[PDB]
Model the fold of this input.
Amino acid sequence: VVGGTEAQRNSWPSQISLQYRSGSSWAHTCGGTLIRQNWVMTAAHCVDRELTFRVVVGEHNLNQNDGTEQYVGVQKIVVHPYWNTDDVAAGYDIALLRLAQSVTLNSYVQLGVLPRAGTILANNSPCYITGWGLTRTNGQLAQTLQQAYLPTVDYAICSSSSYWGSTVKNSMVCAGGDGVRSGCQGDSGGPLHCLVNGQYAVHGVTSFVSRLGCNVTRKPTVFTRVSAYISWINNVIASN
Ligand SMILES: [Ca+2]
Ligand SMILES: [Cl-]
Done:
């Protein structure tokens, strides 16, 4: 997250860190949203690589013991069947990870609330992106979980020529584009939390930013629209 602030430890308890095994260690690669005690919602693109993945819930600082982390293997990966790694603009950038164990819920570990199917946010709706992604274009991952206030940019604006044009689909949520604040690499798969009727819900799964850079004016961060996938999600969970 570019232009973020450090999240309070218990603000976003459904945020997870999706990590891959690298040597004798683990590296954060993506965010995710805990949606059941044994299921994480993330971006399909986060799991195109044939890596060993684990999920960390209750994580705050990737570089320090927080005393709240639970580490769990990824047991099964269910990528949306229409995902095509060579065409992120087509959408379907969503995947569910069944965790090898059910995590224990507490103030640091909670299920993300998802919007009802079909819900579309009015333009300029208040949301925060959260994640450990780069803090600058071509920068480095955050140590501490970051949040940035990224108001939505509706489809009509987002899919306009000076924004994302045809690249953005109605199955996506755009947010931000102010040139200051944005998602950035390593935020992928994580939530966009939007305040609706007093409650934050995870409306987006971070999907992409401009190849030119993270915080590029009129290139808001683009998220998979969670409310486009509620049936899919429920179908997956019910069949697994
Ligand atoms: Ca930690
Ligand atoms: Cl949360």
